[PDB]
């Protein structure tokens, strides 16, 4: 049976665009019904890496389960959660993606972070995350203290380092900065490692799934 996304794109649904919340739960589907120009997708502007592949890999799913890979209440004792954005508004108020967590400085420091997750389930886990690129050095420091930060994401079949690039992009949804989105499929028995000293849009909800 087809998966109805309504007014949302695959990106808006998978990342958790706040306006894509009433979407009804489904554990299985074949074919995703998406409008030609969905209104609700990447509310916070940025590049969604390997998107078309993701769209293809999610076209037919036999099992789908969302879980809190990194629970908000206990995973980030040393960091604060940003107030999100007006670009991602819900009910007249600023919000953010439901499946991601915008970590910010706690006090006068954005401490180094190392968070890992082992795929205890017997299914593949879709992990998504982002990397923020402020438009100005003032915003970089205001949020992360350090001017030069890094983000590292490593598994047994994935390893990438992300360096924020501070600059004004053309305005999109009133935002000159950007959040680049990334993803990987964590096979059973593998471990993913998140390391950063700033600019990480951390995973909050991941998806254990069986493709096809």
């Amino acid at each position, epitope marked *: 049976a087809p998966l109805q996304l309504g007014n949302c794109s695959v990106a808006g649904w998978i990342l958790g665009n706040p306006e894509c919340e009433l979407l009804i739960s489904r554990e299985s589907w074949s074919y995703i019904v998406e409008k030609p*120009n969905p209104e609700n997708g990447t509310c916070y502007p940025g590049h969604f890496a390997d998107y078309e592949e993701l769209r293809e890999q999610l076209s037919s799913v036999s099992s789908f389960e969302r879980f809190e890979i990194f629970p908000k209440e206990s995973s980030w004792p040393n960091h604060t959660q940003n107030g999100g954005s007006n670009s991602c508004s819900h009910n007249g108020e600023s919000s953010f993606y439901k499946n991601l967590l915008w970590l910010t400085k706690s006090g006068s420091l954005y401490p180094n972070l190392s968070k890992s997750y082992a795929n205890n389930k017997e299914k593949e886990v879709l992990v998504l995350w982002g990397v923020h690129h402020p438009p100005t050095i003032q915003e970089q420091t205001s949020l992360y203290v350090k001017e030069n930060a890094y983000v590292s994401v490593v598994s047994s079949h994935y390893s990438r380092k992300f360096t924020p690039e501070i*600059a*004004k992009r*053309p*305005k999109v949804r009133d935002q000159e900065g*950007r959040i680049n989105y990334y993803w990987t499929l964590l096979e059973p028995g593998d471990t993913i490692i998140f390391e950063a000293n700033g600019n990480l849009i951390a995973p909050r909800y991941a998806f254990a799934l069986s493709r096809g």
Partner: antibody, heavy 126, light 108 residues
């Protein structure tokens, strides 16, 4: 914030090589996020894209002019340049230099110049 | 190779009028379309980015709409300083290509 200024207007003899430079102020031309571009407008015609250059070595020129175009970056002077060989009257135009910010979710690579210079007129004559 | 066709090529309207300019590419470009404004002797200015995003400092009377093969630039309340030539530009395929331009004149 950023300012771009093309080199002075003037003449180029036919079959010779046009050389233009763009002086950049406010940002470094070595920056990885920014691309540097040239565009032209012949008299009474519209706009024609010539190409872009990244400090990282990434370049792309319009197939209409690829063989004749060479672009470069000068980090010492914070400038970039355009060279066009074998010029003809068809190359008589106002040349604009410009900057763009790489933004792959909303633009092809190096394809959205959003800060332009005012342009310099090049006349091909003997 | 992607041909950008603008309509009309020139128009004249009174102060306060609503002005619409159409741009049609030769193929579907999704939302990879930008609108430029070019005044005599001045640097061309990016007004609308990716079909609909207003740029910093541009008055809110300018707006962009459309996707695929039909795009529209709207000036809701034409002002004298809006005299210029307006270009659409596609960013979907290389080489980037511009429309032939639309000259907007002021009726007074």
């Amino acid at each position: 914030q950023v300012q771009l200024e093309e080199s002075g207007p003037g003449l180029v003899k036919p079959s010779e090589t046009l050389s233009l430079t763009c002086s950049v102020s406010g940002v470094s031309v070595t920056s990885d996020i920014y691309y540097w571009t040239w565009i032209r407008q012949p008299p009474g015609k519209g706009l024609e894209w010539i190409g872009y250059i990244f400090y990282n070595g990434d370049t792309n020129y319009n197939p209409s002019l690829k063989s004749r175009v060479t672009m470069s970056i000068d980090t010492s002077k914070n400038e970039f340049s355009l060279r066009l060989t074998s010029v003809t009257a068809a190359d008589t135009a106002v040349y604009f230099c410009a900057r763009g910010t790489e933004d792959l979710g909303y633009c092809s690579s190096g394809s959205c110049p959003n800060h332009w210079g005012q342009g310099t007129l090049v006349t091909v004559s003997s | 190779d992607i041909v950008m066709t603008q309509s009309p090529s020139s128009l004249s309207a009174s102060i306060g009028d609503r002005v619409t300019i159409t741009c049609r590419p030769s193929q579907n470009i999704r939302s990879f379309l930008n609108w430029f404004q070019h005044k005599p002797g001045k640097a061309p200015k990016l007004l609308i980015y990716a079909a609909s995003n207003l740029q910093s400092g541009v008055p809110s009377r300018f707006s962009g709409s459309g996707s695929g093969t039909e795009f529209t630039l709207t000036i809701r309340s034409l002002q004298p300083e809006d005299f210029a030539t307006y270009y659409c530009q596609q960013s979907y395929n290389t080489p980037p290509t511009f429309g032939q331009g639309t000259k907007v004149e002021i009726k007074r």
